[PDB]
Design a protein around this nucleic acid. Sequence first.
RNA 1: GAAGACAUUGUCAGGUGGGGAGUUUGGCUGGGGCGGCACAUCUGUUAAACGAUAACGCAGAUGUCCUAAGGGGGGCUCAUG
RNA 2: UUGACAUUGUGAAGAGACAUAGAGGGUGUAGAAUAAGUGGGAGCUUCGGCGCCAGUGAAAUACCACUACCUUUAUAGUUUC
RNA 3: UUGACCUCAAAUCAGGUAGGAGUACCCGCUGAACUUAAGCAUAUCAAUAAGCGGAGGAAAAGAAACCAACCGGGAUUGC
Lengths: 43, 142, 193, 56, 136, 216, 99
Amino acid sequence: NPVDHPHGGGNHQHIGKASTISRGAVSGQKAGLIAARRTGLLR
Amino acid sequence: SATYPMQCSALRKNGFVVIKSRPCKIVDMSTSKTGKHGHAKVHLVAIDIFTGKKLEDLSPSTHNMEVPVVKRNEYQLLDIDDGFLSLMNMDGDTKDDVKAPEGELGDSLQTAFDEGKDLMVTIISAMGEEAAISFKEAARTD
Amino acid sequence: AISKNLPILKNHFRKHWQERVKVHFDQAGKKVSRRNARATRAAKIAPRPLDLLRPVVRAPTVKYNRKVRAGRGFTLAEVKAAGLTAAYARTIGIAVDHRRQNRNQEIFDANVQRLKEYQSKIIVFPRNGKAPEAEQVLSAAATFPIAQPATDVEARAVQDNGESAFRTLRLARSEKKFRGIREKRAREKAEAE
Amino acid sequence: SNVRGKRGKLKKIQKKYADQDETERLLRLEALGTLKGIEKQQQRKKEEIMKREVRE
Amino acid sequence: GNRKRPVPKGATYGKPTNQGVNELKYQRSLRATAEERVGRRAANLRVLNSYWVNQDSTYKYFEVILVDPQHKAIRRDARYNWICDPVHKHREARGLTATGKKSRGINKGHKFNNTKAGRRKTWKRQNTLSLWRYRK
Amino acid sequence: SKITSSQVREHVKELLKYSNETKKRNFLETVELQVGLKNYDPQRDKRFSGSLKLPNCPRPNMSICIFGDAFDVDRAKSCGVDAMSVDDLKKLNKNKKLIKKLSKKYNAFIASEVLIKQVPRLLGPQLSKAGKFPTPVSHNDDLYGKVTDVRSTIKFQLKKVLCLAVAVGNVEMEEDVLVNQILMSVNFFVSLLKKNWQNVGSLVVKSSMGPAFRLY
Amino acid sequence: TVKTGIAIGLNKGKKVTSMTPAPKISYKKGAASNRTKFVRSLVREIAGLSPYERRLIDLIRNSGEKRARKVAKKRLGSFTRAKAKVEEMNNIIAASRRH
RNA sequence: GAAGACAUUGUCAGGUGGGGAGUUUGGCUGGGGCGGCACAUCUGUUAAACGAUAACGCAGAUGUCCUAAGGGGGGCUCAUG
RNA sequence: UUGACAUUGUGAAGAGACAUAGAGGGUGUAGAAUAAGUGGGAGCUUCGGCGCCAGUGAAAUACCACUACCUUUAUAGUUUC
RNA sequence: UUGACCUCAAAUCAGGUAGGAGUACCCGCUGAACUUAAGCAUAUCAAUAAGCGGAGGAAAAGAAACCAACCGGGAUUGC
Ligand SMILES: [Mg+2]
Ligand SMILES: [Mg+2]
């Protein structure tokens, strides 16, 4: 539920905004990939 | 005044808006109801005329957005030197304040002036900054 | 809220004003206890007159300088002119104020005269012996009343010499108004080589 | 170093990247993609000179 | 330094005029809280005065003078036996020392109309409604 | 204004004292104002350009050519000013050496409203490169009046160099006229200049064959 | 400084005969005594100068009293204290030049 | 041992900051919402031959333009056939 | 998170920026030559020589000043890194 | 070696003192919101309620780094 997490809520299970989180984010916001330089599976 | 207010629903495609203090020209408009009871929200996608960047936004439809005054003006080239065009107005006025275009428009204009056509230049004014957008050739009055 | 043709009221009752309401039910009882305190104090100081001698003195502002009233205490210069030290005056019942000054000779003379009459009227007992009892009065202020000075006589001769007393006031106000600009013009005239 | 904003970058390099061998640095730069940007900027400069020559 | 408002995570639960947490200042002085801690340490003594001796970025340093009201040299010596009167218990806690009166604003003058006989005393005096027997 | 009229009067006095009495020259000496502007960038900032017409002429005798039509040439016969027709300009046939010779011949050019369109097409851009471009004239206006006007024109244009110079007037004029013209030229310069009287690097008054005098 | 007798003007007020009372000793609180002058001179000799006073000495030596007064007005509270401080530092410069 | 007048700490200043706080989120209306503006105005009509007179009645219009397209004078007569 | 001030003392070097005192300097080609640009200038001359007409060159040459950009020394200098 | 001084300790050392209660009134700290503004955020409620520290029969203040501008007044408190 959206009261419990930033990712919670919605009529479909989806994140909403981007899951890469700034290093300057605050407690309660840092849920996801913190300060990611890149994402995805490299080949 | 330089700029005047307008309503989002009063806006329509190929019109000028102010987004983040930039003169922008709309390419896309889309309205979606917020909630079943509520008013629709306007999503605006626009392109800056000077820089070419894409700027978008979402406002209430009843909200008022700022709109610039855009004037397109017609001039004849005199010289292209040091990246600054020199233009010639009807009644013989001359301005050299316009900087030359830096893209493929500027390259095509430079080649056309080098090989010697009489070139008709359209320059636009919006919110105190000046640029050249297009050039043609005078079919008559050679 | 706002209504018919009535004056605009300003009633400051938007705090918890009912927590601070002082109704003086004890006016009569407080007066009775106040008289009881005065009587027991007089019995405690049984020869002495229940209050010190106060000087006559001129009231401060321009609204009240036409009147004269009672002060806190006598000046040290006044008690030295009366011919007794400040400590001795305080012991024999004269209020002394160390922080007021004498700039007015009439007030100074009135206070010196008032001290002379007080020293003539009192009886000072010896510190050791007989104590010749002397039936106190209760108010040195009532035995030495403050009298307004007579400023003039009630009938005189008319002395008119043609200034109308309005032109004089107007010219005085005008020269005060244009004082400093005239010395400014005089200074620049003097320093004009 | 005289130009503005150089010092702020220098502080960072000293703080965290001081113990980097050149080989390690090169690998990191490639992964970050910084190297590609430098190359592109240089390429654009080469392009500018080329255009002038073509006009001539 | 300042006094941080002791609220959990900075939430004040009120109007935005009271949302300040960081730049709030304590109304008493560091000298005052220093001598108050010294009085709590030695409750059998009486705080007379205090003075600055030193400081750095983190601390301010004071020296507190205290007098023992049970010692016979202060029970006698009439210049100082006024401190043995029970109305002088914890003068530094009631703000009766020099810096306490300075912080309470006790001074003569037109600049001290709010705080001259006590701020709360004057507030009660001019917020009282006075009604007489024969209503004026 | 940082510059004061009494200081201008003083500096004009020793300027005319040197030019007239002590070392007289056979040619008539023009008084020059040479300015340099400060904390300014030609590349980024807007390039200011402006013109003013002085009441008394700085240069009465400077050479001017009138490109003109039939009516303009017929009036130019009465004015006594040199002119070549549209047929003459076509006879020139865009030859660079001869048009460069014409550009060095004539300091100023006056052209008709009709023919000012094809003045670039017949002549090319070397007039804009030199900085002598023809000024428009109409059938209604007087040619000799506009010759007097162009001879009294003062123009400030930024270009690329951060220093400008104009000719205020002759040495031979009267002192109050010279003071008034140099004051109105400095006022016009600071009116064109943004952030006025603080982007003024230096103002120099000089006479032809004369030393420089520094006004701030 | 006598009054005029009328209610307005420059010296308005009632004419009363004056007394010129004896001067109060508290009116001479800031007066300098010989003993405190001697103490102040000795401790100035012992302690020397503070760093802002040293840089003020350099400002009178180099940049003049106007810049010295501006810096002293920034350093101390008011312009009056700045003027007095610059005056006494100029006295120290003169005395050290005599030394 | 390490580090060193740099971190730390204190006070100001800029940035970031739904992690959190407080608050707001027009009206008319043949229910409300969408639509429209009947929300400040103007012409003709409804309008019942003084005036006034309603509806989300009908047909339209306004947020400008003009140093003359203002003021005075003189001369002349227009559309059309 | 970033900057300033304080905590915060003690020593050496190397750069940079201003103030105001003065010096010198500018080579694509063509063109008699080494063209930093501007603006005046048709006469200036000290040689009776140099410019001007004329050659070339985008830009023309004497004789004047101005403004940048460089290098360059010094101060009981002012300072920053 | 011995005897001092300074500073810091230990004693079920000799003798004392503080805490807690009460809290109507008093001296301080800390500190809201409901409410009013016909909405609401500055404001208001209120320098209040709640919370904390400290006294007495009263407390506090109090003998001018005052008020004034007059012919000057003269500690504090209260009406
Ligand atoms: Mg979700
Ligand atoms: Mg704290």
